[PDB]
């Protein structure tokens, strides 16, 4: 069986989501070959962790997980195992012992607008840290100085979520970079994808 794995919707990726809704998917039992994933457009980051890109296909695994979302262009270097940042504590994060691959590249042609595509938002406040691979759907008002406001979101109490613009007429750091995260596991059944 050398049939195509459904990677088309992963890459061309009709539309996307936000950071907290980091769009978990599940696919398995296909034929994996990343020659399609080879360089085709100007790519700004292909520095992925613990694995040789050459030997991705010869040695194959089970239970592959691949997700994507949007991120501000300046922080793209901040997603690392054991790396600090507000995204690590208040948004989707990654544990230290990470084995998988990752890609980054700017998307200015379709994600730009005369004012900015304000659809994409992010979370700025939580109580404490987050465990790896968790989706937070909290909506209650976050307190700042005790005395909870009970939905007022006024002085001394701030709403946990915020958003930022995507105006094309900016610098490099403000350009929206589409990023895809690759993860997997070893498990104990016969392999599922490679070939």
């Amino acid at each position: 069986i050398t049939n195509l794995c459904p990677f088309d919707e992963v890459f061309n990726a009709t539309r996307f989501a936000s950071v907290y809704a980091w769009n978990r998917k599940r696919i398995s039992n296909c034929v994996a070959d990343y020659s399609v994933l080879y360089n085709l457009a100007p790519f700004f980051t292909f520095k992925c962790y613990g694995v040789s890109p050459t030997k991705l296909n010869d040695l194959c695994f089970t239970n592959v997980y691949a997700d994507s979302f949007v991120i501000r262009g300046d922080e793209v270097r901040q997603i690392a195992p054991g790396q600090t940042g507000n995204i690590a504590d208040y948004n989707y994060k990654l544990p230290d012992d990470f084995t998988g691959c990752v890609i980054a590249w700017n998307s200015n042609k379709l994600d730009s607008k005369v004012s900015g595509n304000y659809n994409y938002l992010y979370r700025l406040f939580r109580k404490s840290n987050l465990k790896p691979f968790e989706r937070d759907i909290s909506t209650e008002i976050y307190q700042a100085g005790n005395k909870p406001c009970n939905g007022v979101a006024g002085f001394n109490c701030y709403f946990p979520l915020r958003s930022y613009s995507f105006r094309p007429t900016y610098g490099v750091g403000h350009q929206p970079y589409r990023v895809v995260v690759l993860s997997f596991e070893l498990l104990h059944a016969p392999a599922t994808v490679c070939g």
Partner: antibody
Framework: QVQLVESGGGVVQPGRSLRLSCAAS????????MHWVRQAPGKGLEWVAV????????YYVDSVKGRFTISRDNSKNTLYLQMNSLRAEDTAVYYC???????????????????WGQGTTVTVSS | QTVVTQEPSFSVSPGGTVTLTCGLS?????????PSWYQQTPGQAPRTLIY???TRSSGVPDRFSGSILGNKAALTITGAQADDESDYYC??????????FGGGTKLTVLG
């Protein structure tokens, strides 16, 4: 393709349950969620209820906790607007809305009113 | 109460530019959640103008526009005409199952 037909309006004594329907044609309402709203005579319209992935959530206003319930019919492609034990506090020409999609962020119910009109009138009186 | 704001009425001559604003009693418009403004027709079915800052709708004339300007969300329309002589509703989404509307702002053209 996006046509809506509704029935079940009328006037009756308070304190008895009423059945009203928002039947849809041209697309499957069971595909994805929608909502609906009421408009008081003269006074400004205000929201009542929203539905979800057709199995996910049953969010209501704070004013109707413990007295309202919503229902759907996937096989016949309609949703039931069950109205139990009419109170004089509710009297409008409320009508159902449209929001189907499948690819978006979910911090809200989103996809507000987009197609309205040609609905049913419900009045409660003693 | 969570009821936000609604101006009583505003005045403008036709053929020019008209703005419209609905502030917040909480004063936090920076929430960046969907601001949506809706037409009204007294006695018949209203329709849509904007769903999300300035995200334009389908089948719409280009003269209408609007965005978060200043600290409080507003609107601005130019080349006004007698197409829609009625009030409008600005809607913000807060509450994870909670919806806020307004009483309407009775825009009246003077020509």
């Amino acid at each position: 393709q996006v046509q809506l037909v509704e029935s079940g309006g009328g006037v009756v004594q308070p304190g008895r349950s009423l059945r009203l329907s928002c039947a849809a044609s041209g697309f499957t309402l069971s595909s994805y969620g929608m909502h609906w709203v009421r408009q008081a005579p003269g006074k400004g319209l205000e929201w009542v209820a929203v539905i979800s992935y057709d199995g996910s959530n049953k969010y209501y206003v704070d004013s109707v906790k413990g007295r309202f319930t919503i229902s759907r019919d996937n096989s016949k492609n309609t949703l039931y607007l069950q109205m139990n034990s009419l109170r004089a506090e509710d009297t409008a020409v409320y009508y159902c809305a449209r929001g189907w999609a499948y690819w978006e962020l979910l911090p809200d119910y989103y996809y507000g009113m987009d197609v309205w009109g040609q609905g049913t009138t419900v009045t409660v009186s003693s | 109460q969570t009821v936000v704001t609604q101006e009583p009425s505003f005045s403008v001559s036709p053929g020019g530019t008209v703005t419209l604003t609905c502030g917040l009693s909480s004063g936090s418009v920076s929430t960046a959640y969907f601001p949506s403004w809706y037409q009204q027709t007294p006695g018949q079915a209203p329709r849509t103008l904007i769903y999300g800052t300035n995200t334009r709708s389908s089948g719409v004339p280009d003269r209408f526009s609007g965005s978060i300007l200043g600290n409080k969300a507003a609107l601005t329309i130019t080349g006004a005409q007698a197409d829609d002589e009625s009030d409008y509703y600005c809607v913000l989404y807060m509450g994870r199952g909670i919806v806020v509307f307004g009483g309407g702002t009775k825009l009246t053209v003077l020509g």
